[PDB]
Structure 1
Amino acid sequence: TEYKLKLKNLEKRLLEELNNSQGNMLENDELMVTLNNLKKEAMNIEKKLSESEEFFPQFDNLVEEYSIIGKHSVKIFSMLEKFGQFHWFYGISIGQFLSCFKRVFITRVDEILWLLYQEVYCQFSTALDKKFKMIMAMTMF
């Protein structure tokens, strides 16, 4: 909407000063360079407009390739939630879980997944006593 308001803006300047006075022998040419500039901003528009049709299927595909990471993390989370329901000290929010998952970063999807387990264990193993560490290892495994 920015670029289409910029086009409409020069499209407005064109209409405005094309009718202005009549002859336009000189100045409208001095505007035409502004509409020649309009042609370049119109190429900027088609550039973004063309890479939209490229964006959607690449995006729509990337949600499918990453599906698995989600579906593992809902069950890994669900496990941690169930630890929390047994004893007050073992609670967890989706906040901590997402905050942990961010650390995974800072066969690719496989790696990002394997890291997920290893980083969730590595962190939250510490909030649990030996018994639950062992429950947690065996479950997650």
Structure 2
Amino acid sequence: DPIISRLISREFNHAGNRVTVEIGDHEVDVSGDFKLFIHSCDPSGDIPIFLRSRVRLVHFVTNKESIETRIFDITLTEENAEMQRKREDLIKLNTEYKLKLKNLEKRLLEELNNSQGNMLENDELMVTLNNLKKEAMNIEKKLSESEEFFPQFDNLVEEYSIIGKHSVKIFSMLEKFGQFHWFYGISIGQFLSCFKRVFITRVDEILWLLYQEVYCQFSTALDKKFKM
């Protein structure tokens, strides 16, 4: 409805202490601890141009585009498990060691001010700072191997793109049967679980493995016409 309207555009009438907003008729006081979110379920439903312009539109939608992204993660786990293992920790320990570098700098300054009049305790943190000579240079060790890992990651996106582009066209096709008939539904997870079974010219053979496994699992939930 229109009335929220002044609450969507940031309009207010300010007072000495009170902040008032006009809603339909009554002028009501705004807190400031108050937050607003608007939630919608169907993308088909169209929102007013007033709102769409003042509103930050964010799509939490598990699209067909999401399938291309998610088949590469499954492919790489079964194609180069050594580099998919190191992918997660590469950006994890990038941020974690830098947060621990900031956590140890704070520990050093706390004890340097407390144990300046006390015995040479700082030394007990300096052997932890001796351990930091692995940590500071661990980052250097990881940054060096990153410049080696990233261009290899980008080399592996291409093959999976070749796999990826066919799989969406296949999901599109199976999705479209559900549009004709109610019983002909497919989830993204059903296609993923099917593509996992595909493992347990290499790119060309895996492609042929996909088409076969999809024909194998999803042919069953269709009638003779839709099979053909």
TM-score (norm 1): 0.73
**In structure 2, do the counterparts of structure 1 residues 21 and 88 end up closer, same or farther at CA, with 3 Å as the change threshold?**
closer
Contact 2:115 2:121 in 1 (8 A): no
What CA distance in whole angstroms lies between the structure 2 residues aligned with 1:91 and 1:15? 61
Cα offset, 1:125, TM superposition: 1.3
Farther-moved stretch of structure 1 (115-124 vs 13-22): 13-22
Check the 8 A contact 1:104/1:112 in 2, yes or no. yes
Q: CA deviation at 1:80?
A: 1.9
Report the CA distance shift for 1:74/1:30 in structure 2 as closer, same or farther (over 3 A). closer
Query: Aligned to 2:219, what secondary structure does the other structure show?
Result: helix
For the 8 Å contact 2:97–2:139, the answer to whether it is kept is yes
> 2:179 maps to which residue?
85
Q: How far, CA to CA, are the matches of 2:155 and 2:166 in structure 1?
A: 19
| Deviation for aligned residue 1:44 | 2.1
2:218 alignment counterpart: 124
| TM-superposition CA deviations, 1:86-139 (whole Å, max 9, x none) | 333323233322222222123332222111001000111111222332xxxxxx
Distance 2:192 2:199 in 1: 12
State the number of aligned residues.
134
C-alpha contact (below 8 Å) 2:115/2:122 kept by paired residues:
no
Q: Which moved more, 1:20-29 or 1:48-57?
A: 20-29
Name the residue aligned to 2:196. 102
- Once residues 21 and 126 of structure 1 are traced to their aligned partners in structure 2, the CA distance between those partners, rounded to angstroms, is 75
How much has 1:71 moved relative to structure 2?
1.1
Structure 1 residue 72: Cα displacement = 0.8
The CA RMSD measured in Å over matched residues stands at 2.8
Amino-acid identity (%): 99
User: What is the CA distance between 1:34 and its match in structure 2?
Assistant: 2.5
Note the C-alpha offset of 1:20.
Answer: 5.6
Instruction: Tell me what 1:138 maps to.
Output: none
Q: Structure 1 stretches of 5 or more lacking a match?
A: 134-140
Q: Is the 8 A contact 2:111 2:122 kept in 1?
A: yes
Alpha-carbon contact 1:18-1:24 (below 8 Å) kept? no
Q: What aligned pairs does 1:40-119 form with structure 2 within 5 A after superposition?
A: 40-119=134-213
Q: Which moved more, 1:60-69 or 1:114-123?
A: 60-69
Check conservation: 2:178, 2:184, Cα contact below 8 A. yes
More helix per residue: 1 or 2? 1
